């Protein structure tokens with residue numbers, strides 16, 4: 001099929017850069033301001049290994065350890081991008097919680113999860129190492145990657161990887 005349609009949900013603690021990361025991939029530029037997100041939805045094309053896709057990304061509202069995981073993100077989503085900020089020990093802690101909640105609701109289903117460490121560029125304020133994010137991602141059997149909403153290439157690879165992990169379970 002010339003074109004496949006896959007829906008992606010982007011979850012994580014507030015201000016980690018879910019929007020920026022998404023904007024970078026879709027529009028191509030790095031938005032420098034900060035407007036908390038209620039929920040934006042972009043539909044962009046992207047080819048992964050010759051297969052073109054009609055990617056529908058759901059850039060969700062930041063969540064914290066207490067917030068309840070929304071049910072519409074619980075069904076009919078082909079892949080999840082769980083992102084956190086390497087400049088925040090808090091985003092990392094919260095992501096572990098959101099991951100568990102996600103798995104609960106999704107029931108016993110083979111849904112592809114991918115962990116992303118954002119703000120790779122903010123060297124001076126990095127508080128989490130690469131190896132720590134990796135370990136976690138390995139505890140989940142999820143593809144791990146670090147990225148920078150300013151480094152467009154790293155933003156494209158995040159969404160490219162989720163597709164890659166998607167097709168894997170399908171097959």
Ligand SMILES: Nc1nc2c(ncn2[C@@H]2O[C@H](COP(=O)(O)OP(=O)(O)OP(=O)(O)O)[C@@H](O)[C@H]2O)c(=O)[nH]1
Pocket residue numbers: 012013014015016017018019020021031032033034035036037038060061062063118119120121122147148149150
């Ligand atoms: N230096 C740097 N700043 C970033 C990066 N990614 C995001 N930011 C900044 O982090 C702040 C918040 O980014 P957002 O994309 O709004 O984060 P968010 O998770 O969408 O925010 P919520 O919708 O509330 O969850 C903004 O100032 C972004 O410009 C990055 O890779 N490097």
Ligand SMILES: [Mg+2]
Pocket residue numbers: 018019020035036037
């Ligand atoms: Mg936002």
